Structure formats: C-alpha cells, structure tokens
Symmetry: D2
Subunit: 213 residues, 4 copies
Amino acid sequence: LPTTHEVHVYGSINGVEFDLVGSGKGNPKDGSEEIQVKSTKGPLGFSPYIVVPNIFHQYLPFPDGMSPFQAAADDGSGYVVHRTIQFEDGASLTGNYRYSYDGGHIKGEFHVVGSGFPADGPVMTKSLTAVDWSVATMLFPNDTTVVSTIDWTCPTTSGKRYHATLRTNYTFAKPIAATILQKQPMFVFRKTEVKASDAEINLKEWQKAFHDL
Amino acid sequence: LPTTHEVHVYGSINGVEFDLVGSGKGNPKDGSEEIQVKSTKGPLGFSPYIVVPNIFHQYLPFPDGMSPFQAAADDGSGYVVHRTIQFEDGASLTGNYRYSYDGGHIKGEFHVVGSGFPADGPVMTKSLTAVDWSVATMLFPNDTTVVSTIDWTCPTTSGKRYHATLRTNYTFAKPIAATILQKQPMFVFRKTEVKASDAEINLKEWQKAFHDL
Amino acid sequence: LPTTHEVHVYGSINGVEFDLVGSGKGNPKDGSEEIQVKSTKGPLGFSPYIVVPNIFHQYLPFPDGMSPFQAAADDGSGYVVHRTIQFEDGASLTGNYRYSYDGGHIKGEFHVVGSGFPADGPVMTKSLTAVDWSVATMLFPNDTTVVSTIDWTCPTTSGKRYHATLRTNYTFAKPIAATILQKQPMFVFRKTEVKASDAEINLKEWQKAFHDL
Amino acid sequence: LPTTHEVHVYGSINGVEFDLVGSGKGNPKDGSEEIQVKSTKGPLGFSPYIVVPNIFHQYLPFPDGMSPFQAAADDGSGYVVHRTIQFEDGASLTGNYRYSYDGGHIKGEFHVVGSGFPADGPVMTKSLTAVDWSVATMLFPNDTTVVSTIDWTCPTTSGKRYHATLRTNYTFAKPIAATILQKQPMFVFRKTEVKASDAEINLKEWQKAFHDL
C-alpha cells in the first residue's frame, strides 16, 4: 500500500512549456492525499487550478476493499492513465500518466498538454478561485479497464463557474479482481483545498468512493 | 409538500406517437417516489427504460432543508423543466415538463420527443435491461435557475452498457431561497426499480441529495 | 416542388413564451430561400439570430437530383424534424418541426423551446451580430432517416464568436430513393443575411449541397 | 513551400505501444499529399484507419493565398498541434505534433495515445473499412491560434458508420497574417485513399479549403 509519493508534470499550455516537481503523502486507509509542487521554469502563466487533477488514486480504498487503482499499486503491476479535459471555453487539456512503485512510495511522471485557452479567459488571466467538489462516475467495461467521467467546475472571480468535462481511461497491466468488477458503477466524491503562489502549489485532497448511499 | 402525483407523457419516438398516463405517490421526507403508467395507444415500440427519467423532484428534500424543486412545489410557484438526453448512439430525446399543484397533489404534463434511435439499436429492439444507479451534479447559476447534468447508462442484454448524458435546465417562477443558493454544487444519488410489460411501466425511485460525504 | 412557404414558430425562451408568424418564397432549383417573420406577443427578449435556423430544406436540391427533403416535399409524404442545439454557454434549444404541403406551398409548424441562456450572455443581451456561414455533414443511417450535424457560430459585439453544435434528426414517412442513399456523406454549405428589429426578422438564406469538391 | 516530408508516430493504443515511420510528398499548390508508413514494432493490433489523421496541413493552400499552416511552414516559424478525437465508443485518441523544416522538406514527430477502445469494437477488431470524406470548420480566435473541428466517420464491415469528433488546436510561433485572419470561418474538404497491410499503411489525401461556394 502507498504511503508517500512524488510527481513530475511537464508539457505545455498554449504552446508555452512548463515543468512542475514535488512530493507528498497519503493515507491508503481513507483516500486522503496531500502534495506540494514547485515550478522549475519560472512563474506559471496560467491558473494553478487546472493543474489540480494533474497533481494518485492508488490512495483510494473502496468500501468493501481496495480500489482497482490501489490494488494495482499494492500489486506493483500498476496502470497507465489517459485523461482528456474539455472546457466550455473550447480549450483542451490532455494528460498521460505513468507510475513507478517502490515499497509504499509512488513516483509519478505526468505529460500534460493544454491548448486553446482564450487569452482573456479565466485560465490565462488566473481568475479561477478554486476547484468545486466533484463526484466521478466509474465503470469497468472489461477486466483491464476503468473509465471515469466527471462534470467539473471552478468558480471564477466574477462569481460565475467555469465548466469542463473530464474523461479518464485507466489501462491496467493485470486483470482487476473479480470482486471489484462485480460492483458497478462506483462513484468517487472529491474535495480539494489549495494554497498557491506563482511558482508553488499546495494541495490537500479528500476522496471517498461509494456504490450506494 | 407533495404526497401524491400523476403524469401524462405524450410525444413521439422515431416519428411514432406514443402516450402514457398514470399516477403514484412519494415521501417528501426521504425522496422516495413510485408510479405506474400505462400506454393509451397500444404496445410501446421502444425500450421502457428511456421513459424512466421521463416518469418529480418536488419529493426531493435537502440535508439542511428543502430542495429548490420541493420549495417551489410547497410554494405553489413551481418551475418548468427542459431536458436534453443525448445517447452515444446519436439518438436525441427532449423533454418539456410542466406541473400543476393542488394540496399535496402534483399533476405533470410531459412533452417528450425522441429521434435517431437505430432500428437495430438497444432502444428499438428493447435490449436494455435496467437503468444504472446515477449521481447528478447540480448548480444554481442564478436565483431562478437550476442546472443538472448526469452521466447515464443502461445495461443491455449483451452485457455492454448503453451510454447517454442528461442535461436538465430548471426555470423557476420565484427566486430560490438564499439558503439553498449558498450550498453548491449539490449532488443527487438515484436508484430505480422497474417492472414493465408492453403497455405498462411500474417505477420505484429513491433519491438522496448531498453536499458533503 | 416547393415555391412558397409560411411558418409559425411558438414556444419559449428561458421560460418566457414567444410566437412568430410569417411567410416567404424559395427557388427549389438553387436552394435559395427568403422569409419575413413577425412577433405576435410583443418585442422579443432574446437575440433574433438564434431563430435563424428555426425559420425549409425542401428547397434544397442535390447535384444529381433532389435532396431527400425536396423529394419528400414533391412527394407529399414529407418528414418530421427533431433539432437539438447546445450552446457553449450551457443553454439548450430544441426544435420540433412539422410541415403541410399544398401545390408548391409549404406550411410549417415549429415548436421551439430554449433554456439556460445566461442573463448576461450574448443571447439575452442581444449581443450576437450575425450567423456565420456553415457547412453541415449529413448521413442517411437507414432509408427513413437523415442525420445532420453542424459546428455553428455567431459573432458577438465583443468580436468573439459564440459557439454551438446543431444536431438535427429527420424522420421520413416514405423510404428515401435508393439513388440518394447511395451518395454519403452529403455536405450542405449555407449563408444567411439578416435584417431585424424587435418584432420583425427578415431572412435570406442560400444553400448548396455537395458530395465532392 | 513544402515539397516532401517524413513522419514518426509513436505512443500507444489501449496500453500497447506502437511505432510508425515513413515518408512522402505533397503539392503545396493543390493540397494533395501522399505518404507510406511502416511499423517498427511488429503488426498493428488496431485498425489502421484511426492513424489516417495522425499521418501535414502545410501543403494546404487557401483560395486567396497560403493557409496559416503553409505560411508558417514557408516562414520556418511553424506551429505545434494538439488534437483530441473522441469516439462514440468512449475511446479517446490524443495527438501532439511538432515539425521541423529544411528547404521544402518537413520532418514530423507525432506523439499519439489512444485508450478505451472496446475489445469487441470496430477499432480493435479491424472492422473499419475506410475514412469518410470530411469537412472541417476552422476559426482563428486570435493571431496565434487556429481551431478546427470535424464530425468524423469510418464505415465498418457491418455497414454501420463508426462516429467521432475531432478537435484540433494549432498554436503558432509567429502571428498569422492579417489577410488570413480576415476571412472566417474557413472550411477544408478532405478525401483519403488507403491501402494497408498489418505493418504498412499507404495514404493519399486531397484537401481543398474554401470560404464561399
């Protein structure tokens, strides 16, 4: 089971390269997770709130056991992640994640590319104030795949919310336990707390999976 | 507060008119709701599971009080509903709902039009077996509007799920209480139990709203 | 073949009813079409440009013959139309069209419902200045169905474009000629010229279908 | 102006790595383009038709001059490409392209990741037979950006079409000529001819941009 982790996010936003590095910890018992990342290429020219999702589901447990992400982590077999975020704005944000495991410690390597954010939009003018709490709907179409969709919003300075949809496809190296594949769909409620500057982002995340309420 | 209700759904599916009528009850205390509807134009030529959403949020309470739908019902001012469902298939299903209130009794008049369902698709061949439990994400952009989006699925005979997205816009006659507008987003978990024949559909629905978990 | 037509559009926008009536003509030889409509319930509280699409494809010819819409008009069998427009805004606009034929004269009865347009948005503040020329992609999934999708935009006062996607499903009473079903996809380029006041909208539309270029 | 080019596409599909290499030529005068690519990691486990778009708009001229892509190529300043393809299936395909210019010769480096393709779907079972001709709608939101959206389809063995939407965001290093930014929207009609085996794909593409018809 995962106890600590580190990340390296690299790529570009509107054609401008950026690079983040940092580390944190988490409780595989309750899904809580926290991390701090810092830019290695100067101040970020975009809102830090779009990096939130791009900055460890292996910490997520399920009601009756481990989540497929957590089991694949404990297992060492792991999984790869392909995430697509489409903003009401027309902007696109793609994420490709890969992980490495070593005795409770996770090393994440995330390639993130974002484009089409309007120059006068909430993202480029850093008008987003936070990430709204969200609930993801997850399905397991086959024993090696998890699909998660989220209706996402970030409040802006002007009070209006900035909308987007997240679609994340997880591809596992080893078959997911028959126990897990049995309960579908699985929903995940998330909350985040963010404190950030121009070159540093601090995140606290809470995750809670459920099949019934 | 609502205690009983009745519905009249009319319109067409793939150009073929249909008409449903029926009544039921509900518990405004826990969001439970049940109803039975019957066709008045012969056997239904399409899966009954697409009618589920089209067959009363006024029964939905909130953790700290009434839901805007329930408050508008208790109030008598009410609201109108504009629903759009888009299936992975390419099929479209539009719903326009209007209600009438009379001492705890609700009368619903729903105009529903569906089109583009493939002749060999799950809907026209009645291959859907049920409606998967779902969680809706609701926001209140202004004091007279509620927007609810849902990632929806219905299992089929072949085991694969049939996907769709629901987008429902609620327009209220009177401003929604400042108390409600304060907590956003609001999520609603729903479960349904369906027993149906060619000209009769019986539905039991459970709804549970939550802001935190 | 159609030579003249009239329309009656009714329904509501953001819960506020509206009603339009008017007539015009068209050239079934080149797809040109023109019409004038006037409100019967006072000044329109929303941009007239969203009514453009809602204000006669039977005038549309194909390179090698008639379009399925035109053939169904000449035939008298006709077709029904289910249109869904989703704006980047979150606003939804549904259209249900039905026609009547009488010796080259078409009578249209359009039920249009729109909702979720932000009070400060381009539509409610009438900031749209025109409808951009567009190209629709049409497919015929079966002999009684035509599906048309369009990436649509309207320029605003602020210079930025307001985006939407149109999805229109056409259901025919009689099978579409095998000749037509043979050439897919079929694209339709459209241009519009609009002159409008608070209670009157004048439209000139040019349509040109093509399979190759 | 570009006369010849070569490509290197690498990445993965459903977690399985793949790598393509090849070269071709094109006519910057008419937008025609052709290329041959071969796998360097064994037979491809997926339909070659999804690689078509992933296998040079710099060859595209405009009616009144060069296309922004072609001008940036002739210029040497270039542009980067961020493409997102979403299939009706739920599958996602992301593309990140970068180019290099050297006296009429273009070298492309494309990172392509695809996920969520059903094991029994048209892509994984190689049931696609071709790419349908298409028309893209392009806009230039600012002097350094081009956004292109396409309603895309590929016929399958079973006769039904497999649907997807392509969204491509182009970010330029230098401002696009005022002349070009003046005419919007710009549409691009494309046709492809494909001959392919398990480790080799041959493509012929025809492109034609237009503002008016």
